[PDB]
């Protein structure tokens, strides 16, 4: 019945003014990409930074199991695009937000399916 809740703990830590996880791995790119959220190669547009996925994944970075019965990571081995305004905390961003399964952009940060 007991399973540690790391997402909740990071969100609470952040809201207390704790400093966001650093050393997220930012990539050099053209910044002329599709802007989709999670891609096989860096795809930042002019409003985004692209990062190596593992380094932006809370579970990867904290050495804890992934929330997924198979243990699969959505980010490792891919690149995550993060709005440049939020790139001070790529881990917080990927945790709090969600990817539209239709167009592949971040809901509210690219997704226009409304």
């Amino acid at each position: 019945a007991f399973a540690v809740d790391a997402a909740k703990a990071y969100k609470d830590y952040l809201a207390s003014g704790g400093q966001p996880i650093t050393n997220c791995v930012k990539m050099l790119c053209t910044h002329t990409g599709t802007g989709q959220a999670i891609t096989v190669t860096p795809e930042a547009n002019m409003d985004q930074e692209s990062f190596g996925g593992a380094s932006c994944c809370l579970y990867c970075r904290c050495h804890i199991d992934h929330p997924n019965p198979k243990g699969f990571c959505d980010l490792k081995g891919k690149y995550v695009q993060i709005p440049t305004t939020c790139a001070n905390d790529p881990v917080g961003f990927t945790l709090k937000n969600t990817v539209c399964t239709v167009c592949g952009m971040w809901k509210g940060y690219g997704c226009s399916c409304d």
Binding site: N23, C24, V25, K26, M27, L28, C29, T30, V40, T41, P42, E49, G52, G53, A54, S55, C57, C60, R61, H63, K76, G77, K78, Y79, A87
Partner: protein, 299 residues
Amino acid sequence: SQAWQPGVAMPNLYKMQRMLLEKCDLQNYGDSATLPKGIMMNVAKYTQLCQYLNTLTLAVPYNMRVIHFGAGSDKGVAPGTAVLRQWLPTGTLLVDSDLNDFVSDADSTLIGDCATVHTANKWDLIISDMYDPKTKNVTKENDSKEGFFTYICGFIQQKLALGGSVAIKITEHSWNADLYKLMGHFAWWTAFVTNVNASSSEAFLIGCNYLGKPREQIDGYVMHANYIFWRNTNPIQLSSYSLFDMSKFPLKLRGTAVMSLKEGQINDMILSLLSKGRLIIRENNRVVISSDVLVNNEN
């Protein structure tokens, strides 16, 4: 002039010399390049490395296999692996490794001394950024070092496909004479200094298109002396210019042919194709790796 390149390759004339080994004294030693905002040194360094590899004749087959030693960092992540995976065609199998634990975008990661690592399959490209901290404890003559360099020479001879390539990081004191000797078993070779780290004696020893036999006999003690002589007499201006043009960064998927071939079958026509970046010789079986684990009961 060099400053708009990703870095500088050892000019041929320095390779042909017969210098004695001196101390390296770089006039910009320690200086720091100005990196684009928020970019780590190792992302810039590996980006310039890959931008330079783009100008060589690397074999790039379907189902390419790449292994990356020394991929960890004191940060617990793997910036060079992230650049390699960006550079390499999507789907390239990428394995990395390091003594200390780290999180990686590689398809598989092995934690341990590199001498514990074994692979059933051969590889088309080997990258190493291994560097031993103790090499900093400079207690004497600068002699050829063994350690992980001995592993790397064996690993190349045993598990690098014909036609495959290597980039192995060295410095003034982190080097090995047989590794230079082994550069003569490639169709071409150089020592490449990135422009972002031009103030360091670091270079990448690059062997391009492996032939499995000596094209050239190289005295590795002399060749490192030659490399230091070059660095000593050719100050390189720090530069991050090339980082601002990523339009042509991805390695082109050439679809290089892979054939298996017994030693009896490597004729001069084959050697010619190997040396041009047009052929890889290895089996195309499944990639299987392991790390040896020393078992002990301390109770």
